Amino acid sequence: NTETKATIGEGSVLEQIDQGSILKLPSNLLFENATSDAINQDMMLYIERIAKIIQKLPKRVHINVRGFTDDTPLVKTRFKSHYELAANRAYRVMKVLIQYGVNPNQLSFSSYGSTNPIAPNDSLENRMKNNRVEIFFSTDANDLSKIHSILDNEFNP
Amino acid sequence: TETKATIARKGEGSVLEQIDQGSILKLPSNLLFENATSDAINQDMMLYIERIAKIIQKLPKRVHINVRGFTDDTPLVKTRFKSHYELAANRAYRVMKVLIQYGVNPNQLSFSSYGSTNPIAPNDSLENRMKNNRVEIFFSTDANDLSKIHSILDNEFNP
């Protein structure tokens, strides 16, 4: 079990994988609703906290803000695809993280569309998980790569 | 650790780079797009993406593929694009869609945007500015064995 309930802000989870850490935030911690990028102001404070924690981090950490949606139809709104919707949600989280002073050079945003469900869509809590945002923290370490390349150049002709 | 990636064979500078958590295939804008300010793709570059799509099916089942967009910081005056972020996302998006066309599994794809941050060279000549307009495809897995080992040891030994 590489997952712990986070707070700071209930329902979030911190997961560790071997290449980095993932902060998973349910839709409702951030957005008015699952099918829009309007970031409810009652949660501006939550992103401020994450931003502050990022500033306890070395400058070599990249921060990648990731968007996810369910299979819900998109007629209701301005977006053309779930890819588009998820990108826009992740961009907004990113921009707010920049508002609070995270360095743009340490940030990117990604969209997974609806292709990465964590759960079936058989509730509300489940819907919120499928519409989560994830913040992924890693670096670009290449020591092992350089080691291998040096030896490989020196030994494989 | 960076090696030339023979694909277009005109001397564009597609490169493969290895880092500790994955592999990066670098593709210059000229290889994919008409200009550095649109996402309409070169009609000749399709075969080259098809090639990559085919090599993806050869990869381990655990692999995720992230298509990353980057731009120079040259002002946007011309287009429908309200930002470098928006421009770069659309470029990564279009490339991702082509990969899908050619049978890469969507459940293993995503696309990312770095806007004009993280340049490969200073934005100070027309040469370097164009160097910053590339697309990078990143390959990695979500291995968490080491994390699970650690968490099991920690629960027996700590709290």
Side-chain angles (χ1 to χ4, degrees), chain A, chain B residues 1-6 8-30 32-44 46-47 49-159:
Chain A
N1 183 16
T2 57
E3 288 208 339
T4 60
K5 283 174 193 171
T7 324
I8 283 270
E10 203 285 318
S12 54
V13 189
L14 176 62
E15 200 201 4
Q16 190 172 40
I17 66 178
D18 303 359
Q19 70 174 302
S21 315
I22 305 163
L23 184 61
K24 312 197 202 204
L25 323 160
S27 186
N28 48 295
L29 297 177
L30 297 160
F31 291 102
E32 299 191 355
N33 48 60
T35 60
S36 171
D37 68 347
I39 161 173
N40 173 20
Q41 221 149 132
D42 303 43
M43 306 300 177
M44 277 288 275
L45 196 359
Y46 189 41
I47 288 155
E48 186 179 39
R49 197 73 180 82
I50 297 169
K52 168 167 195 58
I53 303 161
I54 269 134
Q55 298 168 208
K56 293 169 190 197
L57 293 175
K59 295 177 156 168
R60 61 205 167 261
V61 76
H62 182 75
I63 295 131
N64 179 238
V65 178
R66 285 164 189 205
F68 302 89
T69 67
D70 53 30
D71 305 324
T72 279
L74 294 168
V75 41
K76 52 228 64 218
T77 72
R78 55 158 188 119
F79 315 92
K80 273 158 299 193
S81 74
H82 289 113
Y83 281 121
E84 206 190 86
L85 176 58
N88 282 276
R89 285 153 75 87
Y91 173 65
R92 193 47 67 209
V93 169
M94 191 190 60
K95 295 296 268 139
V96 181
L97 280 173
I98 295 177
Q99 296 196 85
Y100 289 112
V102 180
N103 182 1
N105 303 341
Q106 283 178 87
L107 280 167
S108 59
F109 67 100
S110 313
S111 168
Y112 286 70
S114 54
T115 66
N116 186 343
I118 48 195
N121 265 143
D122 54 7
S123 75
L124 169 84
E125 188 198 304
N126 283 338
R127 206 173 154 235
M128 296 291 108
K129 306 209 182 170
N130 292 327
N131 296 280
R132 82 249 190 219
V133 166
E134 296 177 0
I135 292 38
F136 168 70
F137 306 82
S138 63
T139 80
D140 274 6
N142 70 348
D143 270 352
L144 293 167
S145 297
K146 284 176 163 174
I147 279 153
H148 185 84
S149 150
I150 290 154
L151 296 158
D152 178 71
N153 279 171
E154 196 64 21
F155 285 98
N156 179 204
Chain B
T1 60
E2 276 216 310
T3 50
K4 181 106 167 203
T6 287
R9 278 172 214 86
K10 293 189 308 312
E12 279 253 279
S14 297
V15 281
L16 186 68
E17 174 183 5
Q18 194 182 20
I19 56 167
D20 300 5
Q21 298 301 328
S23 276
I24 311 167
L25 185 55
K26 308 194 175 197
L27 315 182
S29 180
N30 322 255
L32 308 166
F33 302 98
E34 318 261 44
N35 48 53
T37 70
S38 196
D39 68 359
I41 294 184
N42 274 321
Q43 224 172 310
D44 328 330
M46 300 291 271
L47 164 87
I49 295 155
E50 187 180 17
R51 219 198 140 190
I52 311 158
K54 277 188 153 199
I55 311 145
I56 284 145
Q57 267 73 77
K58 298 178 179 195
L59 303 178
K61 72 184 178 194
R62 315 83 146 348
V63 74
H64 180 99
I65 302 106
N66 186 49
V67 182
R68 289 155 179 210
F70 302 83
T71 66
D72 59 53
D73 71 351
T74 294
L76 289 180
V77 166
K78 219 153 208 172
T79 38
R80 43 261 168 65
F81 300 109
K82 291 291 148 191
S83 61
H84 290 287
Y85 284 126
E86 164 161 281
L87 181 52
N90 282 270
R91 280 147 80 91
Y93 183 43
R94 291 288 198 185
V95 177
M96 195 198 75
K97 282 202 140 172
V98 180
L99 284 166
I100 289 173
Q101 251 192 75
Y102 298 113
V104 181
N105 168 214
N107 306 330
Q108 296 168 78
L109 280 167
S110 65
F111 64 93
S112 296
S113 166
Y114 291 72
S116 63
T117 76
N118 282 182
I120 203 152
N123 289 294
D124 67 15
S125 54
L126 287 165
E127 233 356 296
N128 303 348
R129 280 168 193 127
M130 185 62 74
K131 289 186 205 277
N132 294 325
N133 280 326
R134 83 285 194 204
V135 157
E136 299 182 357
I137 304 173
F138 178 64
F139 305 88
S140 71
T141 68
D142 283 341
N144 66 352
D145 274 4
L146 297 174
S147 301
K148 285 170 145 197
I149 290 163
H150 189 77
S151 131
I152 294 170
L153 287 175
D154 183 65
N155 289 349
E156 296 300 304
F157 287 123
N158 198 22

